[PDB]
C-alpha cells in the first residue's frame, strides 16, 4: 500500500525482520507473494510446504516465486492443513515475520471452508451443511431460490444451475466441497479395474496423486504435468485408485485412441470393459462402464442421432465416480464447459500440460473443476532426467529490405503472410535443417500459415502435413519419419500442436507462430520433451528454435509468447547470426528470387 520513491512498495514499517534471517530462507510479502531460496539447506522442506499452500508463478533456478490465494488455501485445507498447521510453520520459516493482512487472509480462507458441502446422490445434488446458520444467511439473495428446483441440513438444487451457484459461492465466501468418498459408497458398485505391477510411477507422479488423495476421499482438482511426464499414466492411476465408473474426455480422435491404448497398457481391466463413445467407431458404450469420449460429442448442441441420443441419455442417467478431463485449458469454452453440467460426476479430475490462456477464463477452472492440486516443476524434472533438457533459442532473422518496405507501407494485415515468408528466415531455416540433418537430429518444423508452410515444403521438397491432409497419407508420412533413415524431418501445421503421439525429435524449428499464444508455444515445446533412452540433462540433446523476424510484430508476439516458458525457467538464448550461413549455399541468394517470392506473396491476396 505504501510506495517508495521508486516503483517498489515500501514495507519498512509494515513487518519486522527476524534476527536469524540467514537461517530463515523464506519471504512473505503483504500481497501474498513469497520468494523462496533454492540454495538454502532446507530448500526441499520449504518447497514442499510452499507447494502445498501456494501455486507457483515463477520458478527460476535461484529464487522461486509463489503466490497464495483462496483456492490454494482451500486445497491446503482439503489435504488437511489447518489454519494453525500452516500459519505457525509459515511464521517459523519466514525470515521477516507474517504481515497481519496475510494472517487474517489465511484465517478467513481456512475458516470459510467445509461449512457448505455439495453431494450428488440418486441424480440429485444436495447442498449439505452441518451448520444451519450458513444456509440461513446464504438464502438472502433471490438467485438461490430461483436456482433451487421447484443438524446436517441439505436441500436439492437444479442440475443446470450448479455452475452459476458454485461461482456465486466462491465470491460469497463459502466454497463448496467436492470430495468423493469412494471408500464409503454403496450406491454405485465398484468397477473391476486394477493397476498392474508393470506400470511404474515416478516420484513426482506419486506426489501429485498423494496431493489429490490427501485423505481417504478423493479430491476434485487440476494436476498440471508435462505431456512427456506421463499425465496419461497419472490419470489411469487415479481412475484405478478410484475403483469406480470413470469417464475420460479427450479433445480429438487421436486423444481418445491414445487414452484407450493407455488404459489397456497400464490397467488390467479387460478390453471389452472399455468403450469408445466416438461417432467414427463405437464399442457398445452402454455395455461397459469405463468410457472414453470427446467434448464435442458430449456437448453437441445440434440434432443428435438416434444411437448417440440413447448413449447420451444413458450417460446422463448414470452417475460417474470419476470424470477425467484431458487438456482442461479448453474447458472454459462455452460448449466444452456445458459438458460439465451435462454429465454428473462426484470428482472431475483435470489433466493438462499447458494451463495458460489469454482470456481471463483460466481462473474459472478453479470452480469449474477445482483448485490446481499439483503443478510439476519442469526444472526439477529436467535435473532428474525425466524430461529431456532443451536448449531454447530464438533465431533473429533480419528482414529483407523490399519485404520490410511493403510490410511497413501497408497498414493492412497481409504482414502475417509477409513477415512469416521472408528470404532471410527461409535461408536460416534451410541452413538449420541442413545442419541438423547432417547431425542426424529429427526435425519437426512448425508454421501457422498453411500457405507459407506449403511454399517452404515445396521449395525444400519435404512432406508437409496440414488439416485436410488425408489420414492415410498422414500416417504414412509419420511412419516414414519414424523409420526411414533417408528422411528425418516433417513439416507439421497447427494440427500438430492440437493432439498427437509423435516420435521423439531432437530439434523443433518454428518458422511461424499463430500469435501471442502461450498455449501453442508450450504445446509445441512439449513434443521434444520426450526423454531419450540414455541421454543426459547437461548434454542439451534437445533443441527448440523459434525463428523470428527482426523489427516486426513477430518480435512482440514471440516476447509475449515465451512468458510461460521463462516462468517455468527455460532461458531463451537470442541468436543474431548463424556461423557458416555465408559459406553454405542456400536458396534466395540473389535479388531475383526474393522478387518472385514477393510477387507471389502480393498476388496471394
Amino acid at each position: 500500500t505504501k510506495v517508495d520513491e521508486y516503483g517498489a512498495k515500501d514495507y519498512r514499517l509494515q513487518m519486522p525482520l527476524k534476527d536469524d534471517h540467514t537461517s530463515r530462507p523464506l519471504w512473505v510479502a503483504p500481497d501474498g507473494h513469497i520468494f523462496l531460496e533454492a540454495f538454502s539447506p532446507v530448500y526441499k522442506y520449504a518447497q514442499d510446504f510452499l507447494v502445498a499452500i501456494a501455486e507457483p508463478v515463477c520458478r527460476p533456478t535461484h529464487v522461486h516465486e509463489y503466490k497464495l490465494t483462496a483456492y490454494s488455501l482451500y486445497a491446503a485445507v482439503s489435504v488437511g492443513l489447518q489454519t494453525s498447521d500452516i500459519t505457525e510453520y509459515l511464521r517459523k520459516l519466514s525470515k521477516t515475520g507474517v504481515p497481519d493482512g496475510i494472517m487474517q487472509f489465511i484465517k478467513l480462507c481456512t475458516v470459510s471452508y467445509g461449512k457448505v458441502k455439495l453431494v450428488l446422490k440418486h441424480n440429485r445434488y444436495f447442498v449439505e451443511s452441518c451448520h444451519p446458520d450458513v444456509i440461513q444467511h446464504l438464502l438472502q439473495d433471490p438467485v438461490i431460490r430461483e436456482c433451487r428446483l421447484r443438524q446436517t441440513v441439505s436441500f436439492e438444487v437444479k442440475q443446470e444451475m450448479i455452475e452459476e451457484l458454485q461461482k456465486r459461492c466462491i465470491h460469497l465466501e463459502y466454497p463448496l466441497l467436492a470430495e468423493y468418498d469412494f471408500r464409503n459408497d454403496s450406491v454405485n458398485p465398484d468397477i473391476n479395474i486394477d493397476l498392474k505391477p508393470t506400470a511404474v510411477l515416478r516420484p513426482y507422479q506419486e506426489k501429485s496423486l498423494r496431493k489429490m488423495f490427501g485423505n481417504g476421499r478423493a479430491r476434485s482438482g487440476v494436476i498440471v504435468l508435462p505431456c512427456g511426464a506421463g499425465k496419461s499414466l497419472v490419470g489411469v492411476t487415479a481412475a484405478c485408485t478410484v475403483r469406480k465408473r470413470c469417464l475420460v474426455l479427450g479433445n480429438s480422435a487421436v486423444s481418445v485412441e491414445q487414452w484407450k491404448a493407455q488404459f489397456k497398457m497400464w490397467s488390467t481391466i479387460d478390453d471389452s470393459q472399455i468403450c469408445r463413445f466416438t461417432s467414427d467407431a463405437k464399442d457398445k458404450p452402454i455395455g461397459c462402464s469405463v468410457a472414453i469420449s470427446t467434448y464435442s460429442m458430449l456437448g453437441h448442441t445440434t440434432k443428435r442421432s438416434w444411437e448417440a441420443e440413447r448413449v447420451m441419455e444413458w450417460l446422463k442417467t448414470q452417475e460417474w465416480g470419476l470424470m477425467i478431463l484431458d487438456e482442461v485449458h479448453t474447458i472454459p469454452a462455452k460448449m466444452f464447459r456445458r459438458v460439465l453440467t451435462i454429465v454428473q460426476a462426484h470428482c472431475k479430475l483435470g489433466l493438462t500440460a499447458t494451463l495458460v490462456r489469454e482470456d481471463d477464463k483460466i481462473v474459472d477452472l478453479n470452480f469449474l473443476i477445482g483448485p490446481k492440486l499439483y503443478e510439476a516443476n519442469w526444472m526439477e524434472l529436467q535435473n532428474n532426467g525425466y524430461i529431456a533438457k532443451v536448449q531454447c533459442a530464438e533465431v533473429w532473422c533480419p528482414m529483407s529490405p523490399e519485404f520490410y518496405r511493403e510490410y511497413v507501407a501497408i497498414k493492412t494485415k497481409k504482414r502475417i503472410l509477409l513477415y512469416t515468408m521472408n528470404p532471410n528466415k527461409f535461408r536460416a531455416c534451410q541452413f538449420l535443417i541442413k545442419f541438423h540433418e547432417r547431425r542426424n537430429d529429427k526435425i519437426i518444423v512448425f508454421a501457422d500459415n498453411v500457405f507459407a508452410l506449403k511454399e517452404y515444403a515445396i521449395r525444400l521438397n519435404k512432406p508437409y502435413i496440414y488439416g485436410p491432409t488425408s489420414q492415410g497419407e498422414r500416417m504414412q508420412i509419420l511412419q516414414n519419419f519414424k523409420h526411414n533413415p533417408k528422411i528425418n524431418t516433417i513439416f507439421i501445421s497447427k494440427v500438430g500442436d492440437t493432439s498427437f503421439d509423435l516420435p521423439e525429435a531432437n530439434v523443433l524449428i518454428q518458422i511461424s507462430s499463430h500469435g501471442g499464444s502461450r498455449r501453442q508455444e508450450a504445446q509445441r515445446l512439449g513434443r521434444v520433451l520426450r526423454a531419450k533412452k540414455g541421454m543426459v540433462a547437461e548434454e542439451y540433446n534437445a533443441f527448440f528454435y523459434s525463428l523470428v523476424s527482426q523489427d516486426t510484430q513477430e518480435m512482440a508476439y514471440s516476447t509475449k509468447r515465451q512468458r510461460f516458458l521463462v516462468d517455468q525457467g527455460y532461458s531463451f538464448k537470442v541468436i543474431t547470426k548463424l556461423a557458416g550461413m555465408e559459406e553454405e549455399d542456400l536458396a534466395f541468394s540473389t535479388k531475383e528470387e526474393q522478387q518472385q517470392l514477393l510477387q507471389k506473396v502480393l498476388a496471394a491476396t
Binding site: 488437511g80 517459523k92 471408500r183 485423505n215 481417504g216
Partner: peptide, 18 residues
C-alpha cells in the same frame, strides 16, 4: 487393500523442528 496415497499427506516439513 488401499493405496499409499489414501493414507494421507507426507508432510515432508514436519520432520524439521526449531
Amino acid at each position: 487393500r488401499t493405496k499409499r496415497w489414501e493414507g494421507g499427506y507426507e508432510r515432508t516439513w514436519e520432520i524439521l523442528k526449531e
